[PDB]
């Protein structure tokens, strides 16, 4: 029968009540390293045709992601285009947006990331609205991935934000058609786990339920976007192992501008086609005059690290006799790392490699596995 | 009381959305901060006739 004011004061300052912290950090670090133990050389389709389906409906007007959903999805898609064409140069990409119940194609499937960047910049200014259509987007992705050759893997990335979708027709027929066309769909949901997206990811990825990814915050969204630049591991049942006829053009040098064969504009430089001697603007592109894939050796060179990955470096035992006092490829001295008073050399920062048995620091552990992709100890080994 | 309708062939509706965008721009101009509030007026000349 009383009131809120007549109750006793909250005393919030009294509620605040006040070394083994390194161990508490290193157990989480080891759990993070535990999830990276399953490193295997799965065969991955290097040549990809990724259709990026972006939601541009009324669900993007929600400001639960700063500043609104649509603006940062466009920015993260720009960063994803840059990273995808950096790590998968040969792969082509097309961008499709969903708006007002109609799937809209904004850039054709092309190997030039600049066109997709310009298209995303053009979409960034308009306000998203409408009611999304997963079936229209999937049908247009099916139409765009139809002329993709059999060696090139057909993939669809959907940044889906709404929780419900409206389809002009049956969506299970579209799912069956996508399965029959060997199209793998990975959906990055925004709000919650939609059942149709989970079923689509499960059916299109041969019973794999791990291709439906839902973010948690900003950092999880960035990690999920950076997870999609890696080529997907193909199935054993796929038997489309075909030789790809392609040429390596020589970079022509000329001070006189000449007409390119791809855009019919005056270009100083270029690359003369090794088969039909028609110059192109940028690489890697198909030849506009003889329909041959024209790439460089560096474009192939970017993708062996997916074909064979580095085995993850093993944390050294604390009681094990350390070989060196400093790093191998880095020569940073390993400190005492006394986590507590009697910790002594607990969780020593050396990272032994499984082949050369060479010790590396944390910076070398996160550099040799990420930016480099080769162990300097394994190459210094005189086999 | 009376009911009135806007029959469109979905061609002028884009123009209607542009007019709503223009109305939104006018709403932005209504709440615009005055130039003597967003920046200092000390370096400029004194007010008068």
């Amino acid at each position: 029968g009383g009131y809120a004011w007549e109750d006793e004061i909250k005393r919030s300052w009294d509620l605040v009540k006040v070394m083994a912290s390194l161990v508490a950090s290193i157990v989480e670090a080891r759990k993070k390293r535990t999830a990276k133990k399953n490193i295997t050389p799965y065969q991955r389709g290097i040549i990809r045709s990724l259709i990026l389906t972006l939601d541009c409906s009324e669900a993007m007007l929600e400001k639960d992601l700063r500043p609104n959903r649509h603006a940062m999805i466009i920015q993260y898609a720009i960063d994803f285009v840059h990273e995808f064409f950096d790590q998968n140069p040969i792969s082509q990409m097309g961008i499709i947006i969903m708006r007002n119940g109609l799937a809209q194609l904004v850039s054709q499937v092309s190997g030039n990331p600049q066109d997709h960047i310009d298209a995303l910049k053009s979409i960034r200014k308009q306000e998203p609205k409408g009611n999304p259509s997963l079936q229209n987007a999937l049908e247009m992705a099916r139409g765009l991935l139809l002329p993709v050759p059999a060696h090139c893997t057909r993939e669809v990335l959907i940044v889906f934000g709404s929780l419900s979708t409206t389809d002009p027709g049956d969506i299970h027929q579209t799912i069956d058609s996508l399965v029959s066309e060997k199209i793998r769909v990975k959906v990055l949901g925004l709000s919650a786990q939609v059942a149709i997206c989970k079923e689509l990811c499960k059916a299109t990825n041969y019973g794999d339920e791990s291709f439906y990814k839902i973010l948690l915050d900003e950092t999880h969204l960035k990690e999920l976007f950076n997870e999609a630049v890696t080529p997907l591991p193909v199935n054993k049942i796929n038997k489309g192992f075909t030789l790809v006829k392609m040429g390596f053009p020589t970079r022509i040098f000329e001070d006189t501008p000449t007409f390119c064969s791809c855009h019919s504009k005056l270009v100083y430089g270029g690359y003369f086609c090794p088969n039909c001697h028609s110059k192109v603007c940028s690489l890697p592109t198909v030849c506009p005059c003889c329909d041959l894939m024209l790439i460089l050796s560096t474009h192939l060179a970017r993708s062996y690290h997916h074909l064979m990955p580095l085995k993850t470096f093993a944390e050294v035992p604390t009681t094990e006799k350390f070989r060196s006092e400093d790093c191998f490829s880095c020569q940073s001295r390993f400190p005492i790392l006394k986590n507590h008073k009697n910790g002594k050399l607990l969780t020593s920062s050396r990272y032994r490699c499984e082949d050369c048995k060479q010790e590396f620091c944390v910076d070398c552990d996160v550099f040799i596995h990420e930016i480099l992709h080769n162990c300097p100890g394994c190459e210094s080994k005189p086999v | 009381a009376t009911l009135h309708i806007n029959i469109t062939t979905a061609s002028d509706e884009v123009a209607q959305r542009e007019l709503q965008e223009r109305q939104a721009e006018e709403k932005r101009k209504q709440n615009a901060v005055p130039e003597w509030h967003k920046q200092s007026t000390i370096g400029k000349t004194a007010l008068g006739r």
Binding site: - | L3, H4, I5, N6, I7, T8, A10, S11, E13
Partner: protein
């Protein structure tokens, strides 16, 4: 006032074939289309279908 998009008219016809049936035998025959929709929005059929 109410804004009637063309796709709104098409979805009205598709979702409600009774409205398209009343549209076909009246609009080219008796009265024009805006008069038809003005009559329809004031009718009990619109309230029943809503």
């Amino acid at each position: 006032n109410v804004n009637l998009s063309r796709e709104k008219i098409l979805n009205i016809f598709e979702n409600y074939p009774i409205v398209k049936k009343a549209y076909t035998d009246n609009v080219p025959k008796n009265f024009k289309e805006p008069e038809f929709w003005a009559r329809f929005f004031s009718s009990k059929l619109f309230r029943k279908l809503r």
